[PDB]
Amino acid sequence: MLIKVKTLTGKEIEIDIEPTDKVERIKERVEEKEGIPPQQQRLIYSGKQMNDEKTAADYKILGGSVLHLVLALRGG
Amino acid sequence: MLIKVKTLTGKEIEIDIEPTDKVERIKERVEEKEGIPPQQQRLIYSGKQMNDEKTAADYKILGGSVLHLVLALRGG
Amino acid sequence: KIEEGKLVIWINGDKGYNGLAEVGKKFEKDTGIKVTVEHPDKLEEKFPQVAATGDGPDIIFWAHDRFGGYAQSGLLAEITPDKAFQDKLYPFTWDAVRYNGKLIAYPIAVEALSLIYNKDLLPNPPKTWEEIPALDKELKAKGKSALMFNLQEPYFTWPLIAADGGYAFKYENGKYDIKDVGVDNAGAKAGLTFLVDLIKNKHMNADTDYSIAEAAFNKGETAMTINGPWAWSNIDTSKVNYGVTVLPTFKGQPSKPFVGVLSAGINAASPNKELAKEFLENYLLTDEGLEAVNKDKVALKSYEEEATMENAQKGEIMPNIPQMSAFWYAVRTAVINAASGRQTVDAALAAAQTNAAADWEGRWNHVKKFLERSGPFTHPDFEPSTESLQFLLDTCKVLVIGAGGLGCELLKNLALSGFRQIHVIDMDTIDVSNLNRQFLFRPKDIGRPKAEVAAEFLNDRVPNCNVVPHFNKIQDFNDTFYRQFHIIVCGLDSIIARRWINGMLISLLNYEDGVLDPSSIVPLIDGGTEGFKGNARVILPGMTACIECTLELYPPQVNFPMCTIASMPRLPEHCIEYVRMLQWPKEQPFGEGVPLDGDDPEHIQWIFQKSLERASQYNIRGVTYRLTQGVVKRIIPAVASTNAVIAAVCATEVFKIATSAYIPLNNYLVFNDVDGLYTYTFEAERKENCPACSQLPQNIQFSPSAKLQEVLDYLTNSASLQMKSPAITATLEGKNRTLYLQSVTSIEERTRPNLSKTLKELGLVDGQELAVADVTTPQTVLFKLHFTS
Amino acid sequence: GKLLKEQKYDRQLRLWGDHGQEALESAHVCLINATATGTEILKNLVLPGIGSFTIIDGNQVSGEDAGNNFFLQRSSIGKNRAEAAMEFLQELNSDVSGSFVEESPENLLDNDPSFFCRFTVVVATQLPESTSLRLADVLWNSQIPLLICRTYGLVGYMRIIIKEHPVIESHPDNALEDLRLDKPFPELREHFQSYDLDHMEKKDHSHTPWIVIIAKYLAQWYSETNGRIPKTYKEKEDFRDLIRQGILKNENGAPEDEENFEEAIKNVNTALNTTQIPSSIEDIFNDDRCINITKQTPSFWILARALKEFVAKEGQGNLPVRGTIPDMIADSGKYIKLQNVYREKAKKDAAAVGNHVAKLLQSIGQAPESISEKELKLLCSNSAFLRVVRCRSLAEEYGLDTINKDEIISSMDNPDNEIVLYLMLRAVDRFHKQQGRYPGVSNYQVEEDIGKLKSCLTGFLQEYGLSVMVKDDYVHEFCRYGAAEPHTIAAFLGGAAAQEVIKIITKQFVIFNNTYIYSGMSQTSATFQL
Amino acid sequence: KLFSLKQQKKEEEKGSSKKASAAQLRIQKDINELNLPKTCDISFSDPDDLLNFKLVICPDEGFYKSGKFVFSFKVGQGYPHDPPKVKCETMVYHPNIDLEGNVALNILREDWKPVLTINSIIYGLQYLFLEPNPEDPLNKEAAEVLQNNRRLFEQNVQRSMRGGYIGSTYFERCLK
Numbered sequence A, B: 001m002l003i004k005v006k007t008l009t010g011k012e013i014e015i016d017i018e019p020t021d022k023v024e025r026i027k028e029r030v031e032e033k034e035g036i037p038p039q040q041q042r043l044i045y046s047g048k049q050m051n052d053e054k055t056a057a058d059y060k061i062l063g064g065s066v067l068h069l070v071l072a073l074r075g076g
Numbered sequence C: 001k002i003e004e005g006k007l008v009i010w011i012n013g014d015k016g017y018n019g020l021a022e023v024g025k026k027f028e029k030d031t032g033i034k035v036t037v038e039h040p041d042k043l044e045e046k047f048p049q050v051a052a053t054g055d056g057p058d059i060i061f062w063a064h065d066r067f068g069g070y071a072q073s074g075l076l077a078e079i080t081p082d083k084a085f086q087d088k089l090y091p092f093t094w095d096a097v098r099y100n101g102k103l104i105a106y107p108i109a110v111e112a113l114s115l116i117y118n119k120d121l122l123p124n125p126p127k128t129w130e131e132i133p134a135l136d137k138e139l140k141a142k143g144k145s146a147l148m149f150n151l152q153e154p155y156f157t158w159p160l161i162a163a164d165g166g167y168a169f170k171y172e173n174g175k176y177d178i179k180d181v182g183v184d185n186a187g188a189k190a191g192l193t194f195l196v197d198l199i200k201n202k203h204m205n206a207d208t209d210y211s212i213a214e215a216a217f218n219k220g221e222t223a224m225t226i227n228g229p230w231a232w233s234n235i236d237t238s239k240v241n242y243g244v245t246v247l248p249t250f251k252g253q254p255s256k257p258f259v260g261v262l263s264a265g266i267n268a269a270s271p272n273k274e275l276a277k278e279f280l281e282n283y284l285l286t287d288e289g290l291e292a293v294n295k296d297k298v299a300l301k302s303y304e305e306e307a308t309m310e311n312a313q314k315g316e317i318m319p320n321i322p323q324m325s326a327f328w329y330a331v332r333t334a335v336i337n338a339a340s341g342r343q344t345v346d347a348a349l350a351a352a353q354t355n356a357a358a359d360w361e362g363r364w365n366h367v368k369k370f371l372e373r374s375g376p377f378t379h380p381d382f383e384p385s386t387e388s389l390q391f392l393l394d395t396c397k398v399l400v401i402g403a404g405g406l407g408c409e410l411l412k413n414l415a416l417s418g419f420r421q422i423h424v425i426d427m428d429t430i431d432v433s434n435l436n437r438q439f440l441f442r443p444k445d446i447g448r449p450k451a452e453v454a455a456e457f458l459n460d461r462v463p464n465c466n467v468v469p470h471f472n473k474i475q476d477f478n479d480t481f482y483r484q485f486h487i488i489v490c491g492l493d494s495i496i497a498r499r500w501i502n503g504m505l506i507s508l509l510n511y512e513d514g515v516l517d518p519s520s521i522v523p524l525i526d527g528g529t530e531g532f533k534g535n536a537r538v539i540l541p542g543m544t545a546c547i548e549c550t551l552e553l554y555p556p557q558v559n560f561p562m563c564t565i566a567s568m569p570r571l572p573e574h575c576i577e578y579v580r581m582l583q584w585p586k587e588q589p590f591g592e593g594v595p596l597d598g599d600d601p602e603h604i605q606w607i608f609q610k611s612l613e614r615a616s617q618y619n620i621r622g623v624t625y626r627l628t629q630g631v632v633k634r635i636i637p638a639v640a641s642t643n644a645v646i647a648a649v650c651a652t653e654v655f656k657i658a659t660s661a662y663i664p665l666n667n668y669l670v671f672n673d674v675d676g677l678y679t680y681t682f683e684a685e686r687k688e689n690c691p692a693c694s695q696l697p698q699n700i701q702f703s704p705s706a707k708l709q710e711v712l713d714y715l716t717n718s719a720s721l722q723m724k725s726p727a728i729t730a731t732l733e734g735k736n737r738t739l740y741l742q743s744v745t746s747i748e749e750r751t752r753p754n755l756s757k758t759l760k761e762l763g764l765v766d767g768q769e770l771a772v773a774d775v776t777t778p779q780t781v782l783f784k785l786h787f788t789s
Numbered sequence D: 001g002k003l004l005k006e007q008k009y010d011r012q013l014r015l016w017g018d019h020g021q022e023a024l025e026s027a028h029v030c031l032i033n034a035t036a037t038g039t040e041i042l043k044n045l046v047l048p049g050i051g052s053f054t055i056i057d058g059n060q061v062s063g064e065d066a067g068n069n070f071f072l073q074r075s076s077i078g079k080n081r082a083e084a085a086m087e088f089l090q091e092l093n094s095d096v097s098g099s100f101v102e103e104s105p106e107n108l109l110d111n112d113p114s115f116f117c118r119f120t121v122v123v124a125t126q127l128p129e130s131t132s133l134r135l136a137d138v139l140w141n142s143q144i145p146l147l148i149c150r151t152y153g154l155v156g157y158m159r160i161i162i163k164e165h166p167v168i169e170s171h172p173d174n175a176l177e178d179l180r181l182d183k184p185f186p187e188l189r190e191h192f193q194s195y196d197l198d199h200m201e202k203k204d205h206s207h208t209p210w211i212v213i214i215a216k217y218l219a220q221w222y223s224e225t226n227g228r229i230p231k232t233y234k235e236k237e238d239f240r241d242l243i244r245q246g247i248l249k250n251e252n253g254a255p256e257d258e259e260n261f262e263e264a265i266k267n268v269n270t271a272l273n274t275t276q277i278p279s280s281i282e283d284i285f286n287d288d289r290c291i292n293i294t295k296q297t298p299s300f301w302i303l304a305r306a307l308k309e310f311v312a313k314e315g316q317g318n319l320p321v322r323g324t325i326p327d328m329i330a331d332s333g334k335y336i337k338l339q340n341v342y343r344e345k346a347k348k349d350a351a352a353v354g355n356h357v358a359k360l361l362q363s364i365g366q367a368p369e370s371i372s373e374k375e376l377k378l379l380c381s382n383s384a385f386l387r388v389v390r391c392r393s394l395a396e397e398y399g400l401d402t403i404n405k406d407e408i409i410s411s412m413d414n415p416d417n418e419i420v421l422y423l424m425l426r427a428v429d430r431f432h433k434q435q436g437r438y439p440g441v442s443n444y445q446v447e448e449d450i451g452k453l454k455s456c457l458t459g460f461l462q463e464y465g466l467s468v469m470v471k472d473d474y475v476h477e478f479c480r481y482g483a484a485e486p487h488t489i490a491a492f493l494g495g496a497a498a499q500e501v502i503k504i505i506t507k508q509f510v511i512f513n514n515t516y517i518y519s520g521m522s523q524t525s526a527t528f529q530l
Numbered sequence E: 001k002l003f004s005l006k007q008q009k010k011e012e013e014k015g016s017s018k019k020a021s022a023a024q025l026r027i028q029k030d031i032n033e034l035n036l037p038k039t040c041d042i043s044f045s046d047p048d049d050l051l052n053f054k055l056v057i058c059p060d061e062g063f064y065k066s067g068k069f070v071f072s073f074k075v076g077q078g079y080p081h082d083p084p085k086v087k088c089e090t091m092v093y094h095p096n097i098d099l100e101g102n103v104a105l106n107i108l109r110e111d112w113k114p115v116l117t118i119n120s121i122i123y124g125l126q127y128l129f130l131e132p133n134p135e136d137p138l139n140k141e142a143a144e145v146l147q148n149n150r151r152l153f154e155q156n157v158q159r160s161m162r163g164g165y166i167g168s169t170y171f172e173r174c175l176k
Ligand SMILES: Nc1ncnc2c1ncn2[C@@H]1O[C@H](COP(=O)(O)OP(=O)(O)OP(=O)(O)O)[C@@H](O)[C@H]1O
Pocket: A075, A076, C401, C402, C403, C404, C405, C406, C425, C426, C427, C428, C429, C431, C433, C434, C450, C472, C473, C474, C475, C491, C492, C493, C494, C497, C635, C636, C638, D011
């Protein structure tokens, strides 16, 4: 199952994942290709921010689904 | 059964426990009421600091065990 | 703050400051409460400054035309006396001392222009203007002019113009209308044409200014000139006889000079407000007070009875509002030009009409587009209208938290969208580093409160804006302070502050009968920035993701482990931290006790130097002064553009929410522009067990006659709760009240009595929130008391 | 007052540095038309300290203008727009030189055919597709940076036109490290060899760079597989375990906590990545501009060429060693020592690369010293991050046979994709071509123009043969706008536009590739190549 | 669901608080989950004001055994995000306490976290008299002695509690 995840720059990468895979694994797959430390990754899918423990299944991620990396800035 | 773990600043925390419980479950409540992560937590009940994987029963622990806590100087 | 129990009164130098202080001496002598009166220079200018930051005088005396400004900035407190005491003073004076349908000051003295004529030449004062010219032919036959007065000022000339119907600003039942000016009507055009004819028929000359006309009447060369109680002095030094005769009516209608009211205002911060009702309504508003004050150098009927009044009677009261100043400039040149044959009275007044108004033609053209028309994408509750804009312009209270960066940008943005009722809170002072992006500050402002300067820059740049500053931490205002606002926007730079305001607004929510009451909701718009990344979000408390719901979206917190800093440094930052949190505290280089000040150049240098050495011992390179400041101050890189993108979005949304023009951003937007420019928008899901907005008050039903003990039994027995030993508190009369507590003997002893008093006795009321905590509740929970009787 | 400049610019120097700040202060930008948009854009350039600007506006300050502009006072109504704005934009930063010319772009393109050559970048706001297309032509041919900005109601439009923009210091947000464990270099291998993971006391074993740990075990696995290196997730996982077992154990037999090895476990997921040239860097190499030099070939390309040779010679098929490593748990000396190896290595390749540029300047005739070393250093540190952007000319966009339809069409699969907002702008411009005005400016025109506009849309869609359907809603909404320029939308563009212009001047970071469209209606935005 | 701001002024009220502050709600909970050691004693002059109170520590070990120390707590409106203000009112020779009353406890300055409660502070304080921290000294000299000469420190402590001088400053008698 291939899914797309867009980074904080709008760059979209393709990753291969299985319904049974854990969310932190998705992050690892992202880091493999982009170098983005999974510690600073915040993933959104259909308005929910993905817990590292839950699985691709729990969020019902389909084939060509798109995940987005997000952030909250604290400067005023 | 009843047991307490003396946190240094002077508090012996009643996180009442069972025998078959592994040492690893305490830290989690030492982690709630107090919020200390189990990892940054070393516990000494006799010179020998208890091994996570082991149970309360593995240390001749009767219904009157006071403990003492030494948090791990973790992070580089 | 202002000292309680005493009354520091402010008044002007040229106002009898000795016969009044004596009316203050009879005060402390009679009550023990002391009076200190001062006559500071520029106090009418010094008051707004201090009345804003809280402190200042309890009372102050000045012409009503200033209080319009104070009132608007919220510097005055509404005065409130009975109709019986209001009859002691005249029925009209109260308007001059009013704002938004509220009385803001107590009238002291009054003033107005009248006609002064040389008694001998003509012991008949003219009853109308029509005849005034007829006399120049006689006097000129002698070498004199019948009349002569200052024309260079629209104050002296205004009485005649207004005669037939000239009014500064339309006064509706409770407030002045700055959009409808009465200088364009036939009532004024008629009055001006006349003044001009006498300019052409040579009965007069448009150059007759105050000093010219003065030096002439002082010789007894004219029948009359117009003046008042401030000019009677030099006519007595020249032994020239005269009188304070009536102002010649005109075209039937009577004359209408301008009206000034000397009055005292009660500061909105001065806690000694009830001490002002006395010293005034009693120790002044009498014959005993006013005369003692008057013998030094009136609105009170009794003392007044013991010409200036008639004019002020039939003349319109001089406006107090801010737009009034644009009136003077507008008509002043609208007369100069006229009488000078530079343009026709018509076109002349045409100008004055528009130039005095607040909204020039087309000003809100870009806004009106979205409020007056319609379309396929408007919010389902949207309805085309001309009132929305008026709502924006007249009552929509918006608060901006943070001045500088997003703050400065937001003020600009809201001001150019129709908002006028705006507040700004900021706890900081200006720093030279703010100047690369915080465009409302200049080098000369360094050191001043950001909010203060931000407010003054905007109120000037964008006319008719009423920004009200607050040099404070949001954290030092209460729930009642934030409920007054319709909407709140943030440009803060710390998570703690956001967590805080977020909590304050959720605390205002009222869940009546199980369903959240929409009017208890104060929408929160928040934006954050760091370098070229930024975010914005719209939060509707109790309805959508709150700050705490998305709290995890913040990147990992900068944290240096102790073993690393103390024993295993490897990055230059590591060395700088060691010095900052270990070496300094241990050496106190600039004195024992003196803390480290990141903004102190000499502190940074010391830190930089010591850091170079720590680095040296570990062959760690890269320690620079710039990096030392970075680590110490924990600096966030910043530029104007990113703050502009985020403040833009935040502002567009405040607009949509205040007008329902469109549905607001479905809560979240991220922005980044290091690589092309990207944005992403999404609906953050509301956390199910959010510690801040997921807990609803519990409903309990008791009789007002019930005894607090029953409430305790319920909490402890009730199968669904059954707590060990609860603690119950409540807010009564604005203060916290401990109803019952049992984990501290001294308190438990003292509150047990409460246990056998009825909820009607304890002061509780229907809907009231009882806060109860217990080992059973992870966090204090709220029960809403509903009376069954 | 120089030590004063650095005080008020601190927060931005932390972003583009002293060199970037200098590029900025040596620039002269041109703003055409001073409406909210332009004045917002300019303000975001004046504050950061651009050297100078020039506003070209022949129009007069209207009632509206005075209302949605933070730089036009009430009295400026009636007077010249360029002259009024310039006065307030100048109070923002006294270290900036402002000037203006009260003429339209048109007049200037008539009298002085090369008036716009004295500027670094030209910013144009609110232009008709006539002044636009004409202006783009001139500047394109003079090789001059053009940024077109439009604010229509709640829409923001931005067109960047630069024939070629090559950037070195692209400031990537995130990137893979250049650890070289898969293709070690002499000094690196010698370094790892100096470590004996068995004969080290408990502490030294606990304070050893995870990069070393992985280098070692990686050698052990290279044995038990006869020349292999983990590649599959199954293998990577095996390898993770091989390491997880090197962790020294205690008296009980329980594993000692060593964040030392734990980081090794975690970084295995990337450490084993194969050092290689990015495809993008490839394109630069195999490109005519790099394949064939000339005495005209600008710095970037000579530099790119150098790297290209280096690769085939010393690089041994790979780009120069970056020279930096991330932070990790280790004791000072161990870390500093490991870090130094990469530093020196970098310096070295830097020299190598240098000797191939001097080789080219002396083969091109240019002075082998034009390219400074402080400048060579960046080229090396950023070899993996080089980027080249090329915008099609405004002409090729409007041209009937070059218009990119492959994109516009595919985009329209979603009736709401912002692209429809572009289609609507072209149509709005068409309407304004025919009737010398814009749709619905007055309330009494809306009704009527709703239909007139629908026509131009089709006239346009048909002229280029676009099978796309446009929800009628957009047509009504646009007339509804009345070509209004709402301040908050002009302000959003002002920020976005300014930073793009700073990317152009400083040559740092990356610019967007064509058209950016913003919808304040839905707060969404997007980019297209057009 | 949809929201819509109604375009009317808001009903006014005087600056009197109508709802409990987050501080009031947290402290109410912390005070009620109090767990004072045998050596400590808390007190509230006004039972309705749980934001102000005083703590008394009569240690029975370490260098200060047999003494009495009075600390005052002032909980601000930023609690629990901001820590409580704690001042010492008993004059004492201590490495972490100055003569102005300022105390230097870690969790009261940089290590503060909202998960911490009043109990945490009372324990953190109690432990200060058992073993002083020479790393965050408000009384430099006091700290120095503690490290270099362990016995002299102990001496200087007893003499100051009894009433007397250290150097040229008279320390008020503070025995229990
Ligand atoms: N609790 C608070 N109450 C009121 N204002 C606050 C609070 N916390 C932060 N602020 C204000 O929020 C604003 C955020 O602005 P911003 O970070 O852009 O400026 P700054 O503090 O001067 O920046 P810098 O730290 O980079 O110099 C500041 O002006 C700051 O004083």
